Every structure is written in C-alpha cells, then in structure tokens.
Amino acid sequence: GQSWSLSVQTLVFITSLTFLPAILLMMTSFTRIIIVFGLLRNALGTPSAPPNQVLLGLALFLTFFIMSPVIDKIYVDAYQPFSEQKISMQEALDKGAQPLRAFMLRQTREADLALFARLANSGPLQGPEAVPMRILLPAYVTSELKTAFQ
C-alpha cells in the first residue's frame, strides 16, 4: 500500500529512540535480574558491597546474552524488508512486535491474564489469541516481580 514520507519517518524514529530506555528494558527484558541482584546484595549483609555500576553492567550483559536469539529474530524480521524498502511501517511495527509478544506470553501467567481480562472486559475465549497490549504488559510485569521475589 501507501506510506508516509522520510521526514515523518525520521521524526517517529527519533521519538521511538527517545522512548527506548524504559519501554524495551524496564518492562520487557530484565527487571527481574536487577531485583534478584539487589536481594543477593542485601542478603550478603553489606550495603553496596559491589558497585551499582558493575551490577548494572553485569545485568545488561546477561540480558543481551539471554535475549540475543530473540533480538536477532526481531532484527531480521524488521530490517530485512525495511532496509531494502519492501514493506511499510504500518505493518512493520506489527511484524516486529509479534515475536516479542509471543516470547513474553510464555513468561506471563494465566491468572494475571484472566484478572486483567476481567478488569478490561475483554473476550476470554477457550483458546488464547493475540492478547491486547493493555493486558499483556501488566501481567508480564507482575509475573516478573513475583518470580523475582521468589
């Protein structure tokens, strides 16, 4: 179909890059690792025995090592058509978001999904299919918090 122009493409790209830190790291990838590292540091009985900078660096390294397959798949399914300009962003965003949502669904929990569906009056159905963004993200956040505490 049709698509918008280079100027607005750059504008939305820069806005997305601005939003990048929180949306892709804090609520998507490794909020559990830093929590568990803080728990270990408090269990050691000495506050800030390892530097916070080194803790964050190790957490980021482990996060990228873990997410390397998923990040590689996202890079493929996004850049490969987009670099050669074969598709438009209106579908490229969905194509790049689908694998991430599929990965996150396993980490989410059925009880959290059901409670949020009850809150947001969404169709439960017997077979899960394309859980909306409004419901999927908070369930992942709370499930990660629960497993981090465990």
Binding site: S5, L6, S7, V8, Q9, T10, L11, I14, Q85
Partner: protein, 106 residues
Amino acid sequence: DRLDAALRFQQEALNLRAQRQEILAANIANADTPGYQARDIDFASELKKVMVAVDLLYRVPDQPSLDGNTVDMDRERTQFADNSLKYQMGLTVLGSQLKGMMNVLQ
C-alpha cells in the same frame, strides 16, 4: 537510499535544466555561423527517462536564410528566460525541502 530517493527527482530536474541552459547558450552564441543548426532537448522525455549521454534534436526552422543559419533570437531569448526561471524554482524547492529535512532533527 531513502534520503537519495527523496531528492533524486529535484536534483535530476536541476541538472537537466542546467544542461538545457548550456545548450541554449551555445546556440545563441553561434547565431552568426552559417550552416549551424539550432539545438535543444525534449525536457519532459529526458527527465522521465533519467528518473526511470544526453539526447538532443534539431529545432524546426522559423524563417529561411541564404547563409544557412536557423536560429531565431526572440524564440531563444524566451526559452532562455523560461528555463532560467524554472531552474530558480527548482533550486528554491530543493532548498526548502532540505531545510525541512534539517529542521525535523530538532
């Protein structure tokens, strides 16, 4: 890539306008040489072909002359003015587009 594609048409229009200006200057400078045929290019076809050396074709003579020359001063001057104005317009459009593309980065 995308940046080059956004400006390719305007850049090629500018280049073709410059080439046609050179052709007009040459065939207005040769206004006294007998046996010299007027030259010019089909701008629309040239631009469409380049966006998809340079092809040039002779001009239809206006009035006969014994020596053989076939250039008409008023016609050449009108074509020169038109091409100059269109070149200026193309330059202005390109400058505005580049200014907007630069401004989008703030």
